[PDB]
From a paper:
The TGF-β ligands are dimers and initiate signal transduction by forming a signalling complex with two copies of a type I receptor and two copies of a type II receptor; all are single-pass transmembrane proteins containing a small extracellular ligand-binding domain (ECD) and an intracellular kinase domain (ICD). Upon signalling complex formation, the constitutively active type II receptor phosphorylates and activates the type I receptor; subsequently the type I receptor phosphorylates Smad1/5 or Smad2/3 to regulate transcriptional responses. For example, ActRIIA/B bind to and mediate the signalling from both activin ligands and some BMP ligands, whereas [name] is the low-affinity type II receptor for over 15 BMP ligands. Of note, [name] is particularly highly expressed in lung vascular endothelial cells, where it mediates the signalling from circulating BMP9 and [name].
We solved crystal structures of the [name] binary complex with [name] in two different crystal forms, at 1.48 Å and 2.4 Å, respectively. In the 1.48 Å structure, the asymmetric unit contains one [name] dimer with two copies of [name]. Using the chain identities to name the seven complexes, they are complexes AC and BD, complex AB and complexes AI, BJ, CK and DL from the ternary complexes. Slight variations in this region among the seven complexes include the lengths of the H-bonds, missing the interaction between [name] S86 and [name] S398 in complex BJ and AI, and complexes BD, DL, CK, BJ and AI have an additional H-bond between [name] K81 and the mainchain of [name] V407. Of note, the interaction between K81 and V407 is also present in complex AC, but instead of a direct H-bond, the interaction is mediated by two water molecules. Additional water-mediated interactions between [name] and [name] are present only in complex AC in this region. The third area is between the A-loop and the F3-loop and is different among different complexes. In complex AC, this region makes significant contact with [name] (orange oval), with many direct and water-mediated H-bonds. Interestingly, 5 out of 15 residues with alternate conformations in complex AC are at this area, suggesting that the conformation in this region is highly flexible. Many water-mediated H-bonds are clearly visible in complex AC from the 1.48 Å structure.
Numbering used by the authors:
A (entry chain D): 29 to 41, 50 to 129, 136 to 140
B (entry chain C): 26 to 39, 50 to 140
C (entry chain B): 320 to 424
D (entry chain A): 321 to 424
Amino acid sequence: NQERLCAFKDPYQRISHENGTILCSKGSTCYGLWEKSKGDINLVKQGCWSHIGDPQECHYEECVVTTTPPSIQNGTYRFCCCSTDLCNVNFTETTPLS
Amino acid sequence: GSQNQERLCAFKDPRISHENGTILCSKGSTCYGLWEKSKGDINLVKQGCWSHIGDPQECHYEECVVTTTPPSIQNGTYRFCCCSTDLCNVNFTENFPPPDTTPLS
Amino acid sequence: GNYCKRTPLYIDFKEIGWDSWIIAPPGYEAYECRGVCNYPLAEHLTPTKHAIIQALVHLKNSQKASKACCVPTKLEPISILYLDKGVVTYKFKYEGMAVSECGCR
Amino acid sequence: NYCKRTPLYIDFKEIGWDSWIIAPPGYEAYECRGVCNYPLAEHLTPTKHAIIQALVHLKNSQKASKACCVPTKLEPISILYLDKGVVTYKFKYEGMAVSECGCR
């Protein structure tokens, strides 16, 4: 199975601090956590996310916030997980045909 | 002693040593013996310590007394007892029930 | 039969009201252990010696002892992001969350 | 009727096992009886899974069963048994007596 290179951020934590990366164990996906608070988007954490837990949130190649954000802190948190190298550096959230 | 839950028991079964035919039984362990007996024929099989865990009933005797009818195996020859005083397992006595009363006898 | 086995159980944290402190994931497959433990207890149910003996007592006299119970016997971690006294807390391996094995206890 | 350790005496002659176990006659095995209801008390050493399943059951009884009251710590007893005519002594025969009950 693949070892993802992922973006890494955790001030309260192999890891390249110089590149802000973590090489994850086989099966693990990348994740990121941002907080959209008072008209700002702030990076909270990034790193590795276990395959264990039947997690459909993490099969996407790109980091996409898919489920209505958690109720915690007034629905400000933005979590995604994704299955390609460095996919967790950024996130995304009438139809295109009309 | 009683405060420290140690007692000396006879030992036969070729942290604690068992020189000169005794063993120390700690943590409230009782002494036990196992003999096999057929009429006047008696053989000592094993002796030593019996854990307090499970608090078996007959290990409350101060003397080594067989109070349960022997198992049917080996022609009813086994004699196990366990007991709560020093060196109590050197000898045994029997005090086990007679078979019950049925309409046929 | 409905023998002791792992069965589906999805945990949605919003349904149990834990979305208040768990940030991610929104829920997960926890599984559960359901079904009966019948004597003789199958080897794959990893019965303990106590479970075997209790199961046999229950068969003879259901008032003396309960059946052995079908319960998780191995649990697996998930990754989690949660609030711990207002602090956002990451655990890659938050233990005890998902059933991998069921047995009779 | 909360989950707790209750007595259970095992008589080997009555269960038919003194064909092979020749000592002791029987012992105090105990058992675990009673219900596990959310919230699960810390003395029942609940697993994270048991706490979550207990809460799901309280919210929706059709979605999950209660956590189960089971032995969580077993202790060894002493035993003498026969293995094809050979007497075997074990001071610590593991898994035989309940010391702790919990919710799993």
